Design an enzyme around this catalytic site. Structure first.
Site, PDB file in Angstrom:
ATOM      1  N   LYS A  57      -6.260   4.652 -13.774  1.00  0.00           N
ATOM      2  CA  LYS A  57      -6.250   3.937 -12.506  1.00  0.00           C
ATOM      3  C   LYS A  57      -6.511   2.458 -12.765  1.00  0.00           C
ATOM      4  CE  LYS A  57      -5.851   6.093  -8.382  1.00  0.00           C
ATOM      5  NZ  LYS A  57      -5.472   4.902  -7.615  1.00  0.00           N
TER       6      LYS A  57
ATOM      7  N   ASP B 279      -1.033   2.713  -4.269  1.00  0.00           N
ATOM      8  CA  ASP B 279      -2.314   3.153  -3.736  1.00  0.00           C
ATOM      9  C   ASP B 279      -2.695   2.182  -2.603  1.00  0.00           C
ATOM     10  OD1 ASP B 279      -4.788   4.719  -3.595  1.00  0.00           O
ATOM     11  OD2 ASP B 279      -5.644   3.538  -5.237  1.00  0.00           O
TER      12      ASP B 279
END
Ligand code: CL
Ligand code: CL
Ligand code: CL
Ligand code: CL
Ligand code: CL
Ligand code: CL
Ligand code: CL
Ligand code: CL
Ligand code: CL
Ligand code: CL
Lengths: 456, 457, 457, 456
Positions: free
Chosen positions: A112, A152
């Site tokens: 991430k 995201d």
């Protein structure tokens, strides 16, 4: 010595607890050594991002890319542009992506990244000049076969575009370095509808197992929240399978059905128009006969305001289901809940359902599936966008949805059968899809790590 | 607000901001505030998992870090520390400081730092070896002769730099100056051992030249050193070569003072080296008869006041080894030049005392205090020349290296001097502040270069 | 036949062929015709689209170019020009010439050139900054310390080289001598400002030595300079250091001549520097009283004939600033040495006059003319040393740089001399032709090396 | 400042004109900014090529690789060895390849390259030693994911072989860096027959639309020129679909059917033998009863010498259809023309058909399709050779032809529907497949460029 990172540490220990609360470290004790090693990221990059605003002033944010685990595949994860963002949070979200991605069955590791760059207020030119400044450093650390980032909170098709353009121009390469791409430059069909379809498809299996086939989605009352492509497609898919969608929501309150039985596709289709060109779910009511059909409650969330429901699909935000809303749902006759949103359900809620499950035999229990299994639909399709780029082909919608369908069935089964091995329930108790899934992601990753000699 | 708390780092961001504000910089140059915004976030940081095996054959796990802070003036330049205290906070602290410290030298070196919370303590050479190997396999890809040239520090000395160099070479398949601190026969420089101590002496030499408008040497000068290790040893030797009288050394439990009207001889120094090796003390010399006379041992004492009439003071043992009291004794003893071999050897009190006497006495009647940030920059200077030599494909002679070391120490001095003269412009006749000068100059050189190169506008 | 018309380029292919034919080269060495065939097509050319954003936030589009012409003797070496005239034709012209000009130096430098039709005119620093950034992002991949080391030129000065250096470093993640023309504190060399002018002087010094078989200096010599910028300024200063009398300067609307039996002083020169800065003129000095006497202003005039009895002439202002008339005045005034600081400062008439008098007067009784291609090669020489220093990881002293500059200027001189002595062998007693010598020597060095390396057989 | 490049500039302004002659810059004004940016190549390389002849003498040519646009994929284009060649020509041919490639729907950008190296006269060893010298420089600038060159005038399977060998040996890599490859080292089936099949398949759709299904290729008279694999396969495919092929041609004149109705496969098959081992179309006649069937007219081209025809497929050279031959065809009852050859039809001809189209309603018009849509069949298969290399598989002929078929239908439709949006015709007028296709390639590429931030 080591810093304090509460949100990451929270998730480590909440994972660990579930493995202790199992028979895994008795059949497989040496796996405790793996949990030591998986839990510290393979690599992390933090880099300065200097960019210019429309007034021409120097600005500076932090960039991060946590590259957590690559035992099962290239790093796969997402970019979050939000001013809350730091390493702790990005290791937390990263840590999950490992096991989630592993439950897909496709070869994708877990990471991430992102920035404390705050989109809000900023113009498209600002975003464009930030995405460019960001990827100038990131570019060197990622790639089609090394790390494939995605979208995201803070970063969408828009940003993915600008990211991919700057990568292309630095690397001088057209490759599947990013997922979430546009139709004309390596996007996949079913991407918008992936996570939604994936949640519904997962629950289909839940219902089947619990009821031994006695019940489908048909004629079930299903409570959804949210009005983005997740809640939209989830809802549509419920309708197709013969189910009734009672609820949708936006950030300003929710809409509940109470004159007629369910939302119609066109009523869903009209809230989609209410999302493009701003607008609000509220707008819909007060208009073409929608006044009668629907009750609007501003400020509130549907969990209590739905009546007697059967299935619950939180598809809006994090932590959008509290311990009260889980108890509401239980009391409302709900028997099936999974998340269309990322960590929509709070720990409190999970604990309540998992208690209710242990205490109520067979179909009488409410059954919760975790995000690392039920809302994998989008990361699955990320996987197939990767696969398409590599093939050098765009598959039909049928193709992708078909593979998604096989991928979600196999997920469900893997959590079921694992839980039945390691968290073996009591006579007529529904196995834990939380523990089942947890174990299953840990064991696939931990094993491959052993195979590849990351621990011994 | 979202940012992690990193107390070591921001205890130093603050320290620098303080200096810069208080100076006249952000008034001639308001816009350099934008530079402190951007300099203060690292260009790149890498942290990576470090799996290595112990002698029992068990998986071990530590964290490796490489903070690559600034590259405006040159390749990342820094050190590796293996200590279980280590985290990002500490290494951004150390890394931030290396930027401005490196810059003072005048050489083309950026600023960075790295290492692990691997604890050398009670590990065998195999274990160290297997850890250096495991650690460099990830680091390898982020460093190079023109990208990042790491070195040693706490937990990382010649043994470790060997094992790092071996693994790098192995993986990269290249022989380049990717580390400093290397062996004699695989790209080391001579004067590495002697770098910091000769540096301290070379700084003072410049100080004397300026203050006495080139009318004095070290020749004759009575020099009070404290400490008995690398820095004290070579410092003394350099004072001796230059015709100076080294009048004192010092230990943990005890100090050594000369017979008066005299100095230590290289062999007496060479004998203190044998004493630290074999873990023995300085008293052990006065035990021997030939030095029993010629030297006085005072247990529990620091030389500052036991020495008599002194000109130069070189604290070179620990931090906080000079009180405001001991500063005044020095002043009253006619001491006119004091630099730190040790970091923060002088307490704030001490600094204020020297800088007070500086402000209230004109010219070379003042006592002049230089900070370790500058006076102790030889090691990093020779790192620099170890780099230059490796690229030249050459081993210079000892003389060549020492001479270039001397020139790098003038550049350090001058950089501080000039800066203080610009941005802390002293009263007429008063020596500029080399504390302030040297605390500012790194920033200004770096900030300007980053403007030149467009990292801020 | 299919080839595009590139008038600038082939106006220079022709010029060289002309020289080489007329010489005795293609008679000793027929086969070097094959070299001119292959040298004359670039090894590599890159052109790339350049999208950058202006202060209104609008898409802009220009063309970037990097001609990488020859690498036989070293890395591509060249300059970037930002001017809206720019195209491939022009940059293959300039690039072709850099090959043979670089070669004369004796250093290992190939020949190339690049830039854009970006027009600096009326762009803000942000705009330049954003363009340098956009431009280097594509260039980055084709250049390097060992591949191509670009520099400045029209539209590309210290400000731009900073912004290029910053972006390169950023992208490549390396600190290397990828540009010349850099800042003092990020890898520049001293004597860069003074490179071309000191070069011109150093060339003549060698000329004098040869012609007078080492029996004369610059000492005493009366020197007629024209121009009042970089080249004229530093040239004058170098003549002064060497014990020479700089007797003249010159402007656009006006010239300056000394009082006779005298020279300019560094401060008077230092005052002409202040005059060009603040965009003022040379008359402005004679306005002041202390120079009102000591100097005569002649508006609209060129010094060649107003100076009296002169030995050395250094045209350093514009092109075509010396007529065939002014050449003859110089000759009759006893001038014996004339080199160009400016490109084509002397007209063909002028050249023929010097070269005529050379052919018809023996030894150092002849006036000797050297072309700018050689006499003005200091800037490129220091580029070379800026390279060498960056690799050495070092800043040499001013003296070191100036001394090496001097040695590179002998190599230029000698290369021409020797060549002319071989391939335009003069009558007995007559000075070889340094026009011809210097127009030939680059080719021969390069062509030979390309044979050595097998680019032709 | 900028040089004069007539053939490139010709094509820029002829593209631009078509976009003005549309409603595109009214719905989408900001696209004018794109046309500024697309029109200047991303990157161009010009490099010296020193090679040796069989006599052992140094030779020197120029190499070029125009890498025009990579918004939709890696640079894709061709290598032309012809002494005419320069940048202007290679930017012209490159510029087209962008939009052509974009109309395929596959992810391929647009470029072009080659040399003024003249094959004619040169031995196989000379060619081999030139291809090797060429790729030694080119190699660094291209690749499986960056730029995939191909064949064109001067460079064939032969040269592609030598190119690929030298690449392989420099790069130390077996990858789909070049298309047009041999069977045993990453070629695709349907490559020889790709462009021919692709033209016929495209027209099939033309006929369908125009005649509302009332007519196929069956029982239509179709005029072909050329006797390479393009004219050959085109012809065969017409026969399969029940059509009659009246004409073939070579560089020395043409052969027209007039005793019997059509060429038979074996008569086509026999002209294929006349192409291998040199030989000429003429040879065929004067022999096994071919004397009666066929009329040979040396020096001429079939456009006028065919009688009343229905479909015209120029499959020989550039500029092989003039304004006269288009007027001949119109008058001869021709209603359908596309190119099997690259730019076979001249501007004059396009103008005549496009006028005839505007003036004649419905099926009564002659309908011309552009090369950027109708003769994409070969670049499509280049695309699928890429896809196969990546898959690590050789697909069956069925597989490739199937995908080609879907690719050509979708092309046609994209030009139709676009033209119906932006060049909306008058009642019963056939929409412009020229403008339709032009717009469609510009808009897909221009959009992706915006998405990726190449303009704003
Ligand atoms: Cl932890
Ligand atoms: Cl890297
Ligand atoms: Cl998604
Ligand atoms: Cl260090
Ligand atoms: Cl020395
Ligand atoms: Cl230049
Ligand atoms: Cl000199
Ligand atoms: Cl143009
Ligand atoms: Cl390259
Ligand atoms: Cl083909």
């Amino acid at each position: 010595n080591l810093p304090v990172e509460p949100e990451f540490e929270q998730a480590y220990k909440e994972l660990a607890s579930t493995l202790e609360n199992s028979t895994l470290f008795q059949k497989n004790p040496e796996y405790r050594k793996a949990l030591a090693v998986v839990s510290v990221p393979e690599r992390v990059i933090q880099f300065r991002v200097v960019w210019e605003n429309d007034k021409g002033e120097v600005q500076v944010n932090r960039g991060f890319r946590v590259q957590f685990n690559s035992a099962l595949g290239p790093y796969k994860g997402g970019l979050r542009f939000h001013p809350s963002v730091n390493l702790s949070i990005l290791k937390f979200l990263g840590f999950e992506q490992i096991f989630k991605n592993a439950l897909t069955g496709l070869n994708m590791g877990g990471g991430k990244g992102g920035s404390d760059f705050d989109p809000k207020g900023k113009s498209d030119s600002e975003i464009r000049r930030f995405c460019v400044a960001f990827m100038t450093e990131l570019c060197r650390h990622i790639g089609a076969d090394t790390d494939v980032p995605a979208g995201d909170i803070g970063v969408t098709g828009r940003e993915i575009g600008y990211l991919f353009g700057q990568y292309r121009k630095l690397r001088n390469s057209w490759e599947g370095v990013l997922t979430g791409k546009g139709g004309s430059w390596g996007g996949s069909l079913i991407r918008p509808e992936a996570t939604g379809y994936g949640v519904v498809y997962y629950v289909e299996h839940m219902i089947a197992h619990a009821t031994n086939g006695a019940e489908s989605f048909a004629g079930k009352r299903v409570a959804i929240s949210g009005s983005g492509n997740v809640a939209q497609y989830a809802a549509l898919k419920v309708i197709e399978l013969g189910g009734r969608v009672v609820s949708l929501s936006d950030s300003q309150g929710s809409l509940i059905v109470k004159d007629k039985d369910s939302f119609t596709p066109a009523e869903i289709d009209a809230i989609a128009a209410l999302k493009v060109d701003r607008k609000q779910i509220a707008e819909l009511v007060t208009d073409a006969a929608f006044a009668d059909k629907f009750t609007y409650l501003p400020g509130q969330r549907p969990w209590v305001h739905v009546g007697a429901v059967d299935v619950a699909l939180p598809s809006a935000t994090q932590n959008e289901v509290s311990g009260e809303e889980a108890q509401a749902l239980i009391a409302a006759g709900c028997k099936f809940i999974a998340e269309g949103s990322n960590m929509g359900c709070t720990q409190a809620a999970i604990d309540a359902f998992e208690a209710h499950r242990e205490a109520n035999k067979g179909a009488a229990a409410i059954w919760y599936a975790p995000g690392k299994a039920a809302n994998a639909g989008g990361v699955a399709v990320s996987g197939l966008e990767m696969a398409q780029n590599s093939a050098r082909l765009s598959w039909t919608a049928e193709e992708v949805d078909a593979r998604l369908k096989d991928i979600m069935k196999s997920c469900f089964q893997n959590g079921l059968d694992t839980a039945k091995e390691y968290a073996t329930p009591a006579d007529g108790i529904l196995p834990s899809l939380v523990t089942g899934s947890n174990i299953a992601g840990f064991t696939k990753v931990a094993a491959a790590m052993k195979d590849q000699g990351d621990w011994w």
